[PDB]
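Before any further analysis, backbone shapes were mapped to integers, which produced the following:

***
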Amino acid sequence: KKAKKVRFYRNGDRYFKGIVYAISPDRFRSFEALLADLTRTLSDNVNLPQGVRTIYTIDGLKKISSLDQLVEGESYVCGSIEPFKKLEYTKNVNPNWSVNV
């Protein structure tokens, strides 16, 4: 209720429909800690295999540099080595994940 919820996708991955992260001082006190956790949750042997290196806005036009740039209910794209790939990441994903808890 009091945490900032955002939804992370994987760059160039047309199938994964995102994971919700609760961002609060209590859960991620630092940017590096957030990226390390994103690698743990999202990086596998074929999807972002080198690890998460970058968080993009949904349009791919900005790389996030600080936790305050993350906005409640917005969606972000985790990138690794390849540049941002424009996909309809959020299509058909109901926004209730950002409303009821």
